[PDB]
Amino acid sequence: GVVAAAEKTKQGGVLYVGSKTKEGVVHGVATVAEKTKEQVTNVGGAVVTGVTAVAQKTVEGAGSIAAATGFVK
Amino acid sequence: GVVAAAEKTKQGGVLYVGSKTKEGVVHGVATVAEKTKEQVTNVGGAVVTGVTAVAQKTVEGAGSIAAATGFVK
Amino acid sequence: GVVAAAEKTKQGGVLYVGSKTKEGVVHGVATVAEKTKEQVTNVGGAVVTGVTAVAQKTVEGAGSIAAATGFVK
Amino acid sequence: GVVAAAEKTKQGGVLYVGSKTKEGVVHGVATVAEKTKEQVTNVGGAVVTGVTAVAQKTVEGAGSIAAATGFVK
Amino acid sequence: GVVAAAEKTKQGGVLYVGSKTKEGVVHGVATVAEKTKEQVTNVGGAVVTGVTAVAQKTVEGAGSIAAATGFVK
Amino acid sequence: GVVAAAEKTKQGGVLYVGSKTKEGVVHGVATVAEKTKEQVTNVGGAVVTGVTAVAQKTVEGAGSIAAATGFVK
Amino acid sequence: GVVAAAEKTKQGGVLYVGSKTKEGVVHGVATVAEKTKEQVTNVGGAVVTGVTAVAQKTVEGAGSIAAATGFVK
Amino acid sequence: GVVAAAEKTKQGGVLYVGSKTKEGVVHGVATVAEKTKEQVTNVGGAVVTGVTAVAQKTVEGAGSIAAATGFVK
Amino acid sequence: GVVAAAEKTKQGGVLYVGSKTKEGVVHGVATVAEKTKEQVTNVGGAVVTGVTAVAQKTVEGAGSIAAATGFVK
Amino acid sequence: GVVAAAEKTKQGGVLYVGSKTKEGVVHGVATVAEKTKEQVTNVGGAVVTGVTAVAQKTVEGAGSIAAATGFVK
């Protein structure tokens, strides 16, 4: 029983970024391996990967993740 | 039983980014492997991968992820 | 039972980006492997991959993903 | 039972992007492998892959993905 | 039982992009492999792949994807 | 005075190569540029460019090269 | 005075190479530049560029190179 | 006075190489630059660039190189 | 006075190499720069650049190099 | 007075190498710089750059190098 449920019921200043750079190496969510048996990646939210990264009001509602892995039995 | 459900019921300033750069290497959500048996990637949300990345009100409602992997039995 | 359901019932300032760059290498959601048995990619949301990436009100409602993989039995 | 269902029932400022660049290499959602048995790609949402990428009100309603893979039995 | 269903029942500012570039190589959703047994690509949403990519109100309603692969039995 | 002179006055076991390969990219003597004023290439000897390259008793006598370039005066 | 002179006056076991490879990228004598004023390449000898390269008794006699470049005066 | 002279006056066991490899990237004599004024390459001898490189009795006699560069005066 | 002279006057067991490797990156004589005024490369001898490199009796006689650079005066 | 002279006047057991490796990165004679005025490379001898490098009786006779650089006067 791997169940995920989500509900969202709606009964309805200044940001300045200045970036000067050179030779930027950026890595995000990176999983590196040798000889696995299983690999899983679930992204319910937001992954922002930049040289300049700005986020505003981003992950604002009703997320759910259910993960079951393995179970040899 | 791998069930995912989502419901969204709606009964209804200044952002400045200046980026100067050179030779930018950016990686997102990257899973690298040798000799697996299983690989899974679920993206319920938002993946923003840039040299300049701006997000506004992005992942705002009712997401769900259900993942089941393996189960040899 | 791999079931996904989604419902959306609707009973109904300034953004400036300036980018100057040179020789940009950008990768998105990239899964690289040698000798798998299974590979799955589900994209319920939005994948924005640029040298300049701007997102506004993007993933705003009622998404669902159900994934079942393997089950040797 | 691999079932996906979706319902959408509707009872019904300024964005400036300036990009200057040279020699840009951009990759989207790319899954690269050697000797698999199965590969699946489901895109319920939006994949935007550019040198300049702008998204506005993009993935806004009622999406669903159901994936079942393998099951040797 | 690989079933997909979708229903959509309707009882019914400024965007400026300036891009200057040279020698741009862009790849979309690309799955590259050697010696598979199965490859599947389902695109329920929108894939935008450009040097300049602009999306507005794009994937707005009632999509569904059901995929079943393998099942040796 | 750009003078070249050459004189050649003649008063007169087992080689086994086995090559197995795939997807070979080979470049020779390659000069690549943007916005020059002058480019010169003089080849008095031998340029062997292969995937399999074997040379035997190749550049064996009396070569001469004279190069003068520029001289704004 | 750019003078080159060469004179050659002649008063007159087992080699086994086994190569097994895949996906070989080989570059020779390569000069790469942006915004030069002058580029010169003189090859009095032998340039062997392969995936398998074998040379025997190759550059054996009487070579000469004279190069003069620039001299604004 | 850029003078080169060469004279050659002649008054007249087992080699086994086994190479097994994969995905080899080889570079030779490579000069890479941005915004020069002058570039010169003189090769009086032998340049062997391979994945398998074998040389036997190669650069055996009478070579000469004379290079003069610049001299603004 | 940039003078080079060379004279060569001739009054006239077992080598086993076994190499097993994977993913080899090899660089030779490489000079890398940003904003020079002059670059010179003279090769009077032998440059062997491989994944497997074997040299036998290679640079055996009478070489000469004369280099003069600059001299603003 | 940049003079180089060379003269060579001739009045005329077991080597076993076994190499097993993986993921080898090898660099030769490499000079890396930012904002020079002059760069010079003279190679009178032998440069062997491999993952497996074997040299036998290599630089055996009569070499000469003369280098003069600068001299603003």
XYZ file of N, CA, C and O in Angstrom, chain G residues 9 14 18 22-23 28 33 38-39 41 46-47 49 58 63 67 72-73:
72
model
N 74.738 13.208 -48.808
C 75.613 12.596 -49.800
C 75.894 11.167 -49.364
O 76.508 10.947 -48.317
N 61.471 -8.795 -35.536
C 60.028 -9.005 -35.557
C 59.355 -7.858 -34.820
O 59.733 -7.524 -33.692
N 49.247 -5.578 -31.790
C 47.852 -5.957 -31.737
C 47.059 -4.964 -30.920
O 47.339 -4.766 -29.736
N 37.883 0.826 -28.796
C 36.557 1.294 -29.166
C 36.423 2.750 -28.741
O 36.826 3.120 -27.636
N 35.869 3.564 -29.642
C 35.550 4.977 -29.404
C 36.812 5.778 -29.056
O 36.984 6.295 -27.954
N 46.103 15.506 -33.609
C 47.504 15.608 -33.954
C 48.138 16.869 -33.410
O 47.962 17.225 -32.240
N 43.168 29.099 -31.909
C 43.346 30.453 -31.413
C 42.163 31.334 -31.782
O 41.332 30.975 -32.615
N 49.278 36.431 -36.859
C 50.023 35.542 -37.741
C 49.971 34.123 -37.189
O 50.022 33.920 -35.974
N 49.847 33.143 -38.086
C 50.003 31.733 -37.739
C 50.831 31.034 -38.804
O 50.561 31.182 -39.997
N 52.888 27.190 -39.731
C 53.133 25.785 -39.423
C 54.101 25.217 -40.451
O 53.769 25.129 -41.636
N 58.041 14.145 -39.695
C 56.876 13.307 -39.935
C 55.881 13.425 -38.788
O 56.263 13.362 -37.620
N 54.604 13.587 -39.121
C 53.532 13.631 -38.134
C 52.650 12.414 -38.384
O 51.981 12.324 -39.420
N 49.523 10.301 -36.950
C 48.364 10.474 -36.088
C 47.338 9.395 -36.408
O 46.662 9.443 -37.434
N 61.973 6.353 -39.635
C 61.113 7.294 -40.350
C 61.839 8.577 -40.753
O 61.994 8.850 -41.944
N 67.377 17.256 -42.695
C 66.270 18.184 -42.710
C 66.672 19.506 -42.095
O 67.551 19.582 -41.237
N 62.652 29.794 -39.959
C 61.420 30.557 -39.835
C 61.726 31.919 -39.237
O 62.387 32.014 -38.200
N 58.558 44.150 -37.197
C 57.766 45.335 -37.539
C 58.615 46.400 -38.228
O 58.188 46.994 -39.226
N 59.817 46.657 -37.707
C 60.755 47.678 -38.206
C 60.134 49.068 -38.336
O 60.793 50.009 -38.773
